From TrEMBL, chains B, C:
Catalyzes the cleavage of L-allo-threonine and L-threonine to glycine and acetaldehyde. Its EC number is 4.1.2.48. Belongs to the threonine aldolase family. The keyword Protease does not apply. Keywords: Lyase, Pyridoxal phosphate. GO terms for molecular function: L-allo-threonine aldolase activity. It is an enzyme of class 4 (lyase). This is L-threonine aldolase. It comes from the Bacteria.
């Protein structure tokens, strides 16, 4: 039962990250992010993104989305996003809670990526009608929930659509490092250079304990996010224990190394499974998330052998396999050999 | 730099950070599905001598707002003290989670609620559709100024909530500091007095960010679970919040850390009150001291590297907060520096 | 000009404005304490053949938002059609009153929910703390596309709500148009089918602004009474909202206005459908008609002075809505003008 | 049968008000304020207040207060008002609901007014503190709930405080005309000349049915008030029947005449009572609201004779008497004669 591909949050934290917390719990520090360790992490993130920004460390990626969307969306506003996006399905209405009831309008798109024409139509729809909610913000997940990745030309176009229609762009980066490692571009080209204004920098699924970051590029919303982070109960007094994780998460490119390894194990797992006759991939994997089609008997037999994964959410035969930074080749190859015998 | 500003400046106890290292191995079911979250819940059931449900949260203000949101309707009112944490230092976190409930201040001394004023506030404009209806009460134990409710005052507040059909929530951010001074069992300070939901605090008493919502009336379990997730306070890697709480309760570490913090405040106040120009404004009950000093003493102590809060309550008024990590040398140093400036 | 945009452009019925002048004499107890508001409620108890509770509101959007808010928790979900009014033309009024409840669109043909698609959306991710919990269903009768739920279709939805622990709300802004086309009793259309709260619409059928929240499950009476006051929908001089509803129901005037509106729509649809280039999306059931016209014909009718809503649902799709004041000459003028354009 | 002085909401409309809705009935009109009568009413208020403004007709004065405060106050903001204000007591948290949970902070003051020193102290309190809500808006009631009337000097002083502290000033004017008639000033001097940004122009208590007006002087919140009026359910389709009330309300100075009559019948009622030996006035009468002390037996006898009033909400023997536009000199003389016989 120890071989699981349900999610990347089942894994523990990196040894370098837990040791940073043990080295941080020394002496006294000014609470609520006014310490020296938090200032170093914000300055380090500025050099990584090659621009000025403001750090808002939060304990949950869902809170990183809800606080970000609340600073940009008025209660009468609308948040354009994908139907399968995380803010629309697996947050228990956390955006609707923080935005004081702003509506989330699902926009058509393939492979978890917003279609540019469908986004422009949704943005201009009923603009000027007092009887309708007004689209103000667009949310894109990078990497997407279905294991796909926006390319640089796909991100730049969405940003331009936001510019032309007066919309704000928020990037859900719970698996940000997986998309960055698969493209090899700089973090700036994948964020603010493409038009992203607020970024939900995710680190928990990539090796941290709970240290998530709201990376704000448009500092005009700084007062909003700061007040809304405290108002939501996400301003921790002993902040240095969340910035200790992020400091080790960014040191020596540990975050890039962890994400690269997770993407390799997923490509190895998808290669071994798609080679089977009765198994097919819904799309070639680009991150650490795999969506494949297996015969229904193969799903039940694999779960009966101890393998844990997510099924029966996206239809019949659809199985989601997610690797982590701590996934070993033995775990991947064992899952391949087990499904091969059933084939 | 010797500081008595608050207990949130200290780190965690060495056992707390080490229990996370042991929990940092292997894979575990996320969002509280691990056996460690089940253990700390079963451990808290044995401590409070009753059945309960645990909801770990990162901050104590989140524990308050989530607890109050499960008990208070939007058209309801939360009866609390004027100087309470939920009414001042949360940026309207209760008003946010409760979908706009109204916090009504109730008169009282030393951050405590007066039973007469509470009864008059609970019965004000009952049945009137034009006014918000009182529904819940919030008390802080120990209070924001370090005062401690007696078990007899908690029973009276609890009986008022039963007579008026209200719900009782306790802000236990410094729960351990009040429990050690009373020497009573946790059950007598909570559900035996009538407390329905408890914000079990541990951060100030030696944890990194382990706060707990202790629900005694399990009829609100579905609302707390949904609102904690809806508010973004449901962490995936729960075993790292549970590992802090496991070491926090193991071998009575929380009772020892609190007894040490309360004891260090007693020595600091007794040594300062022995000075001619230094007097105590209120008797020290937990780990928060309120004393009066000469204005030159305050500036001279802050030039030497001593940190504390002063202007927030008056001229010459100085607040000193000791934590589990304040040493006997740090207490005697601040006293000797004040004695020289005397 | 001759307009078929909506039935809210119409005047007030002469009997409605007459009743307001008959009620502007003397004093009366405010906020519904008068004898006229109590008479209108008792008059509705006899019409619906059951005990109920009346909550007069100035707007049908508020009637939907207040009703759904009393039934939905903030972490809950409202199951409705994609083209429903609460999901399109209320500026998030349900999301506002419900403190951010998520409106989930359920598949359905001709603006009517599919029973098999509704039962799947209710069971979907039940027990998942990460997902919003479906709590209520909202069906519009008559619907926005001009269709009408039959009695067997209303009872099936009511059974699915009872099977999945859901609460049923009925949007009845054009409730009378659906009742007159079926000829059944108001009880058979509402609570007998399983409806728990009804947005009884009267403005579009000849009233100025007297909308009514008819509550059959009186356990939510306290919620609605507090939420319409909390939303600013509790008028002091309510005897002038109940004066409209009294004349609205007097001598079956509301049934006479609705029957006339449906007959004028059947006349308009018959003449247009007989034309060569004009097609009906579906046969008309209420006072609302959706038809397909050539693009040149639409602009030509707009250039002659005729008013209707277009380019909101597609190319060539035109919505024509008749009112109680629509004359046969206005209808025959629109038929003759569109016929000349062929 | 019963001669009541409970409030001015028990009365009906002026004859001109109900006759105006009958004339605005005939014909078809564009809904949701698109008709010509709603525009003409807005044009009249531009001439009455001698400035450019925007009109938002609402059914209740609580809706006028809550919608106005929601446009000015952010969710983390704070509303400064009096403890006994209508928004803090008799609206069932309507301001808290429309503002998405903004806090209402009570400011000390006498006769329902705000003290300038206590207001500056509440505005400067805990500025820049992220843990505390930030004061953003001020709300004053003219005339106050106890019938007291702000002077023009007191109104201008509060306005400069709002400008010195970056605050927005909203005025609750449910009995606006009662205060305007006694001061004898222009409507502009009472509102925007003193710094009022949005006004809850009240008319129901002065002879209307439900024609309450949100008058916006700072049209930067125009888009926000329109969205918040519709989102709250206060955008009526057949608005030509709310503006028809307001057209007759403003025609031929009917609103000034009704308010003067209400203030006159109150001054006559207070003069005849204070002359009696056993009933005294607690405060000088300024508008249509009176406060007087009576022995307990006189209250019970007046209650058994049919007279209606509030008698135990403020103290021992404290009786509040409220006159309206429909109060006659026969109704005033009858109440005084009955109380004189009891004396």
């Amino acid at each position: 039962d120890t071989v699981s591909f349900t999610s990347d949050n089942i894994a523990a934290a990196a040894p370098e990250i837990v040791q940073a917390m043990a080295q941080a719990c020394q002496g006294n520090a000014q609470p609520y992010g006014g310490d020296a360790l938090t200032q170093n992490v914000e300055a380090q993130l500025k050099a990584i993104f090659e621009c000025d920004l403001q750090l808002f460390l939060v304990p949950t990626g869902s809170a990183a989305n809800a606080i970000s969307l609340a600073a940009l969306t008025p209660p009468w506003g609308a948040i354009l996003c994908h139907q399968e996006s995380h803010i629309n399905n697996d947050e228990c209405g956390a955006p609707e809670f923080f935005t004081a009831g702003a509506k989330l309008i699902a926009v058509a798109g393939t492979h978890g990526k917003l279609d540019p024409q469908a986004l422009t139509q949704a943005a201009r729809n009923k603009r000027g009608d007092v009887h309708s909610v007004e689209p103000t913000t667009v949310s894109i997940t990078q990497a997407t929930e279905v294991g796909s990745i926006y390319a640089l030309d796909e991100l730049n176009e969405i940003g331009q659509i936001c510019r032309n229609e007066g919309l704000k762009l928020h990037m859900d980066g719970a698996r940000f490092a997986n998309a960055l490692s698969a493209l090899g571009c700089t973090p700036a080209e994948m964020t603010w250079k493409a038009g992203v204004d607020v970024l939900s920098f995710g680190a928990t699924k990539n090796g941290s304990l709970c240290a998530e970051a709201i990376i704000l590029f448009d500092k005009s919303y700084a007062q909003e996010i700061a007040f809304r982070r405290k108002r939501g109960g996400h301003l921790l007094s002993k902040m240095r224990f969340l910035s200790a994780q992020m400091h080790a998460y960014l040191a020596d490119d540990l975050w890039l190394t962890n994400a690269r390894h997770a993407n390799l194990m997923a490509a190895r797992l998808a290669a071994g499974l798609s080679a089977l006759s009765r198994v097919s991939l819904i799309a070639p994997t680009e991150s650490n998330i795999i969506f494949c089609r297996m015969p229904t008997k193969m799903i039940a037999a694999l779960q009966q052998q101890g393998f844990q994964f997510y099924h029966d959410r996206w239809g019949d035969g659809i199985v989601r396999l997610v690797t982590s930074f701590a996934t070993t080749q033995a775990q991947v190859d064992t899952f391949i050999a087990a499904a091969a015998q059933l084939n």
